Design an enzyme around this catalytic site. Structure first.
Site, PDB file in Angstrom:
ATOM      1  N   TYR A 163      -6.792 -15.152  76.122  1.00  0.00           N
ATOM      2  CA  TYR A 163      -5.620 -15.079  77.084  1.00  0.00           C
ATOM      3  C   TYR A 163      -4.721 -13.852  76.448  1.00  0.00           C
ATOM      4  O   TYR A 163      -4.284 -14.195  75.398  1.00  0.00           O
ATOM      5  CB  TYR A 163      -4.833 -16.350  77.032  1.00  0.00           C
ATOM      6  CG  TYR A 163      -6.182 -17.395  77.390  1.00  0.00           C
ATOM      7  CD1 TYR A 163      -6.739 -17.768  78.666  1.00  0.00           C
ATOM      8  CD2 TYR A 163      -6.699 -18.308  76.405  1.00  0.00           C
ATOM      9  CE1 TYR A 163      -7.898 -18.576  78.768  1.00  0.00           C
ATOM     10  CE2 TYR A 163      -7.814 -18.967  76.148  1.00  0.00           C
ATOM     11  CZ  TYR A 163      -8.285 -19.171  77.591  1.00  0.00           C
ATOM     12  OH  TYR A 163      -9.361 -20.081  77.713  1.00  0.00           O
ATOM     13  N   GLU A 189       0.712 -20.378  89.217  1.00  0.00           N
ATOM     14  CA  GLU A 189       0.702 -20.122  87.678  1.00  0.00           C
ATOM     15  C   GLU A 189       0.382 -18.614  87.410  1.00  0.00           C
ATOM     16  O   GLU A 189      -0.203 -18.005  88.361  1.00  0.00           O
ATOM     17  CB  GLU A 189      -0.389 -20.917  87.230  1.00  0.00           C
ATOM     18  CG  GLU A 189      -2.073 -20.879  87.615  1.00  0.00           C
ATOM     19  CD  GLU A 189      -2.944 -21.774  87.313  1.00  0.00           C
ATOM     20  OE1 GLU A 189      -2.606 -22.860  86.636  1.00  0.00           O
ATOM     21  OE2 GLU A 189      -3.975 -21.491  87.430  1.00  0.00           O
ATOM     22  N   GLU A 199     -14.470 -15.481  80.760  1.00  0.00           N
ATOM     23  CA  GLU A 199     -13.265 -16.073  81.454  1.00  0.00           C
ATOM     24  C   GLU A 199     -11.967 -15.086  80.484  1.00  0.00           C
ATOM     25  O   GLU A 199     -12.097 -15.286  79.053  1.00  0.00           O
ATOM     26  CB  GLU A 199     -13.110 -17.451  81.127  1.00  0.00           C
ATOM     27  CG  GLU A 199     -11.684 -17.887  81.789  1.00  0.00           C
ATOM     28  CD  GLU A 199     -11.099 -18.858  80.923  1.00  0.00           C
ATOM     29  OE1 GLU A 199     -10.748 -18.912  79.650  1.00  0.00           O
ATOM     30  OE2 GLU A 199     -10.847 -20.246  81.273  1.00  0.00           O
ATOM     31  N   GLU A 226     -16.547 -24.090  78.335  1.00  0.00           N
ATOM     32  CA  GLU A 226     -15.793 -24.083  77.202  1.00  0.00           C
ATOM     33  C   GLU A 226     -16.192 -25.270  76.576  1.00  0.00           C
ATOM     34  O   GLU A 226     -15.138 -26.253  76.411  1.00  0.00           O
ATOM     35  CB  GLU A 226     -14.415 -23.885  77.722  1.00  0.00           C
ATOM     36  CG  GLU A 226     -13.904 -22.462  77.809  1.00  0.00           C
ATOM     37  CD  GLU A 226     -12.525 -22.149  78.008  1.00  0.00           C
ATOM     38  OE1 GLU A 226     -11.684 -23.033  78.251  1.00  0.00           O
ATOM     39  OE2 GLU A 226     -12.062 -21.036  77.898  1.00  0.00           O
ATOM     40  N   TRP A 249      -9.665 -14.594  85.151  1.00  0.00           N
ATOM     41  CA  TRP A 249      -9.059 -15.941  85.563  1.00  0.00           C
ATOM     42  C   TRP A 249      -7.851 -15.926  86.274  1.00  0.00           C
ATOM     43  O   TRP A 249      -7.065 -15.450  85.410  1.00  0.00           O
ATOM     44  CB  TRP A 249      -9.278 -17.052  84.319  1.00  0.00           C
ATOM     45  CG  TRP A 249      -8.989 -18.290  85.022  1.00  0.00           C
ATOM     46  CD1 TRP A 249      -7.788 -18.951  84.989  1.00  0.00           C
ATOM     47  CD2 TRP A 249     -10.069 -19.457  85.205  1.00  0.00           C
ATOM     48  NE1 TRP A 249      -7.801 -20.224  85.567  1.00  0.00           N
ATOM     49  CE2 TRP A 249      -8.946 -20.399  85.792  1.00  0.00           C
ATOM     50  CE3 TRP A 249     -11.375 -19.208  85.480  1.00  0.00           C
ATOM     51  CZ2 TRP A 249      -9.906 -21.568  86.338  1.00  0.00           C
ATOM     52  CZ3 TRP A 249     -11.975 -20.312  86.053  1.00  0.00           C
ATOM     53  CH2 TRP A 249     -11.127 -21.766  86.238  1.00  0.00           C
TER      54      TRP A 249
HETATM   55  C1  LIG Z   1     -10.063 -21.391  80.926  1.00  0.00           C
HETATM   56  O1  LIG Z   1      -8.919 -21.391  80.752  1.00  0.00           O
HETATM   57  C2  LIG Z   1      -8.273 -21.420  82.016  1.00  0.00           C
HETATM   58  C3  LIG Z   1      -6.657 -21.556  81.511  1.00  0.00           C
HETATM   59  O2  LIG Z   1      -6.326 -22.506  80.797  1.00  0.00           O
HETATM   60  C4  LIG Z   1      -8.709 -22.494  82.587  1.00  0.00           C
HETATM   61  O3  LIG Z   1      -7.933 -22.775  83.931  1.00  0.00           O
HETATM   62  C5  LIG Z   1      -6.816 -23.615  83.922  1.00  0.00           C
HETATM   63  O4  LIG Z   1      -7.281 -25.131  83.871  1.00  0.00           O
HETATM   64  C6  LIG Z   1      -6.444 -26.085  83.978  1.00  0.00           C
HETATM   65  C7  LIG Z   1      -7.214 -27.496  83.772  1.00  0.00           C
HETATM   66  O5  LIG Z   1      -8.176 -27.507  84.754  1.00  0.00           O
HETATM   67  C8  LIG Z   1      -5.943 -26.028  85.350  1.00  0.00           C
HETATM   68  O6  LIG Z   1      -4.825 -26.954  85.386  1.00  0.00           O
HETATM   69  C9  LIG Z   1      -5.419 -24.727  85.621  1.00  0.00           C
HETATM   70  O7  LIG Z   1      -4.524 -24.462  86.733  1.00  0.00           O
HETATM   71  C10 LIG Z   1      -6.424 -23.496  85.351  1.00  0.00           C
HETATM   72  O8  LIG Z   1      -5.787 -22.277  85.452  1.00  0.00           O
HETATM   73  C11 LIG Z   1     -10.054 -22.793  82.749  1.00  0.00           C
HETATM   74  O9  LIG Z   1     -10.472 -24.050  83.459  1.00  0.00           O
HETATM   75  C12 LIG Z   1     -10.709 -22.639  81.562  1.00  0.00           C
HETATM   76  F1  LIG Z   1     -11.890 -22.428  81.507  1.00  0.00           F
END
Ligand SMILES: *[C@H]1O[C@H](CO)[C@@H](O[C@@H]2O[C@H](CO)[C@@H](O)[C@H](O)[C@H]2O)[C@H](O)[C@H]1F
Length: 300
Positions: A199, A266, A225, A136, A259
């Site tokens: 999302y 979470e 994702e 990303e 994801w």
């Molecule tokens: C795509 O989006 C997901 C959700 O935002 C990201 O996953 C999150 O990443 C954060 C930062 O590392 C973690 O704190 C969360 O637990 C995790 O769900 C993913 O990295 C991103 F590609």
């Protein structure tokens, strides 16, 4: 069964096809960061996902920063374990160079070239492998034309020297949402796909129209994702909008990876706190998100 039947994947007229030219759609799960939740990535859990959920692809999310590969490169070995498991289980596997806080893929480009040289030299003669070179890209100063495309034109040649035509997924701008820009300035490689991430907590009607714009330019899109939660990976489960996206992806034949496979507290996490890292989950060990994702892949 999956990989033996579909074999070599490629892109034909902006669509993912098998070695006999028929459209194919991959649906699976992504790990969470391998430096944090690597216990959930193993042959047994992947075999359970394949047999009980019906997955046909698994995504190994190798964070680069945030305690990932650049800080401790031993996590590359977990990527190898996931790849080997996928080969053993005859399913596809995505090797994800999971940039995020290191928001421009150029930050660690030299390490990325070395990493992708190694992975493609090792597994470049298996049909299972899909390379995702920059999860990303994000930030206002990170554009497709100035930062992402040029990065991709440095890393793709490294891979192609060892693996001429396995699929390469390339991240897009604004956290892999800006497919419009990438579709108007596509890469030369014929077996590339652009990442699109969503999302379900975000109202998605314009985003769906934007994917359709990209598809209309002949760009292939891989939803590498997506989550049932908000963009942060937490903040509620939004199944009505998730279902709208599921249906949209089926109509457009878009492949996807949810994801994520972890027990973290979470909303986007597929598992509950006491889920066994080697699989065999009961209904109670799946979260509301995981229950829905499993149903979608079983229905498929
Ligand atoms: C795509 O989006 C997901 C959700 O935002 C990201 O996953 C999150 O990443 C954060 C930062 O590392 C973690 O704190 C969360 O637990 C995790 O769900 C993913 O990295 C991103 F590609």
């Amino acid at each position: 069964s999956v990989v033996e039947e579909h074999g070599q994947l490629s892109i034909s007229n902006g669509e993912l096809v098998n070695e006999r030219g028929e459209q194919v759609q991959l649906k699976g799960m992504s790990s969470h960061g391998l430096q944090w939740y690597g216990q959930f990535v193993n042959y047994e859990s992947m075999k359970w996902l394949r047999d009980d959920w019906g997955i046909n692809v698994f995504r190994a999310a190798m964070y680069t920063s945030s305690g990932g590969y650049i800080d401790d490169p031993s996590v590359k070995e977990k990527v190898k374990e996931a790849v080997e498991a996928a080969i053993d289980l005859d399913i596809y596997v995505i090797i994800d160079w999971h940039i995020l806080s290191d928001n421009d893929p150029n930050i660690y480009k030299e390490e990325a070239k070395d990493f992708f040289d190694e992975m493609s030299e090792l597994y470049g003669d298996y049909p299972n492998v899909i390379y995702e070179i920059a999860n990303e890209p994000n930030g206002s100063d990170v554009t497709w034309g100035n930062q992402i495309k040029p990065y991709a034109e440095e890393v793709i040649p490294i891979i192609r020297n060892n693996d001429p035509n396995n699929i390469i997924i390339v991240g897009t701008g604004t956290w892999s949402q800006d497919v419009h820009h990438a579709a108007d300035n596509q890469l030369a490689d014929p077996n590339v796909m652009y990442a699109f991430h969503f999302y379900a907590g975000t109202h998605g009607q314009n985003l769906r129209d934007q994917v359709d714009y990209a598809l209309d330019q002949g760009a292939a899109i891989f939803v590498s994702e997506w989550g049932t939660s908000a963009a942060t990976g937490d903040g509620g489960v939004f199944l009505d909008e998730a279902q709208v996206w599921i249906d949209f992806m089926d109509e457009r034949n878009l492949s996807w990876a949810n994801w994520s496979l972890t027990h973290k507290d979470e909303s986007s996490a597929a598992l509950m706190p006491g889920a066994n890292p080697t699989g065999g989950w009961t209904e109670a060990e799946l979260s509301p998100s995981g229950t829905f994702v499993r149903e979608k892949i079983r229905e498929s």
